[PDB]
Amino acid sequence: QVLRGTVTDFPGFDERADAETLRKAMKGLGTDEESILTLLTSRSNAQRQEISAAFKTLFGRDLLDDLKSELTGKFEKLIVALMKPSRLYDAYELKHALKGAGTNEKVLTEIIASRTPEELRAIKQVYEEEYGSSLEDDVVGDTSGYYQRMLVVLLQANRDPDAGIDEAQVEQDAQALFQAGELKWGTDEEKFITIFGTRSVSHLRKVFDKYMTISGFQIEETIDRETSGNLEQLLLAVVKSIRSIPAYLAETLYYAMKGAGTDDHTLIRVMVSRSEIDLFNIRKEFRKNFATSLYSMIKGDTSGDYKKALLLLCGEDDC
């Protein structure tokens, strides 16, 4: 009855002993990667920040700098991601994704569609503090169309609270969405954006069900997951997140590994960002929906200490 992650506070935690263990693992010409990944994946993010502070006090060195030169490749990328303070991680990923014409719309869509209003408010505040501009202004400057407008509405974090069901508004909203999809999501965009973006979660779940009976198909089937523009991808992310954030993020992990290549950036981002929120539930949806465990997919597709660390973050195999 609760959302659970795969990383919890290490019991008996001693930040000074852990700092000593990490320094021992790097001091000298060699490296003890196993010690580094076992400790860091078994301490919570808050504990990692206390280790980093004890490390600087004990040794007069910067733990993150040492990790960056001591480790390489995807393993370094994963460890560095785990060290970023949780409160800063989403804001950082958004800022990194906003790069003019090379902007990574997949990341904007993933984070903004799946974070709660409480999470989005924290993100916007943190983002201004770190980067000196508003998240909205950067998003508007680097996106276009009704995709831009939908992100802006979602960024407003003004979604109705879960309240008494109104079957009259359900039917009206479902009809409005059916008509909007019949026009390929290219007409009266402001009207369906208000529905997807500001109605309550429980309300929209009923709307989607009413859409089924009205239309004969599920609302997702109006959008081709592979051959759709940015707005359509966002609507799909919002619909899926309304149904289940763990299921949306599980599907995101699934497509990150399926096919040729591995989208390691997405693999790292989802595992780390969700490790203390809902990664256990993500695993459950992953196994239920894709007939195989997240553990087995990571194991088959990745290598070395990066794989070892990802498997420890995953926590367990599922079947």
Torsion 309-313-316-318 (CA) sign: negative
20 in contact with Ca ion (CB under 5 A): no
Closest CA to 68 of 56, 78, 54, 55: 78
| 9 close to 46: Cβ distance less than 8 angstroms | yes
319 in contact with Ca ion (CB under 5 A): yes
3-class DSSP state of 12: coil
Q: Which is nearer to Ca ion, 32 or 171 (CB)?
A: 32
Which residues in the 228-257 window bind Ca ion by CB under 5 A?
257
Which residues in the 79-118 window bind Ca ion by CB under 5 A?
105, 118
148 in contact with Ca ion (CB under 5 A): no
| 77 close to 268: Cβ distance less than 8 angstroms | yes
Query: What does 254-291 look like in DSSP terms, one character per residue?
Result: HHHHSSSS--HHHHHHHHHHHTTTTHHHHHHHHHHHHS
Binder to Ca ion among 33, 90, 142, 264 (CB under 5 A)? 33
Binder to Ca ion among 305, 310, 311, 315 (CB under 5 A)? 305
| 83 close to 63: Cβ distance less than 8 angstroms | yes
Identify the residue whose tokens are 């733990």.
Answer: 63
301 in contact with Ca ion (CB under 5 A): yes
Q: How far is the CB of 33 from Ca ion (least distance, A)?
A: 4
Q: How far is the CB of 186 from Ca ion (least distance, A)?
A: 3
- Residues binding Ca ion: what is the number (CB under 5 A)? 11
Q: How far is the CB of 297 from Ca ion (least distance, A)?
A: 7
The DSSP output letter for 184 is T
Using CB under 5 A, list all residues that contact Ca ion: 33-34, 105, 118, 186, 257, 262, 301, 304-305, 319
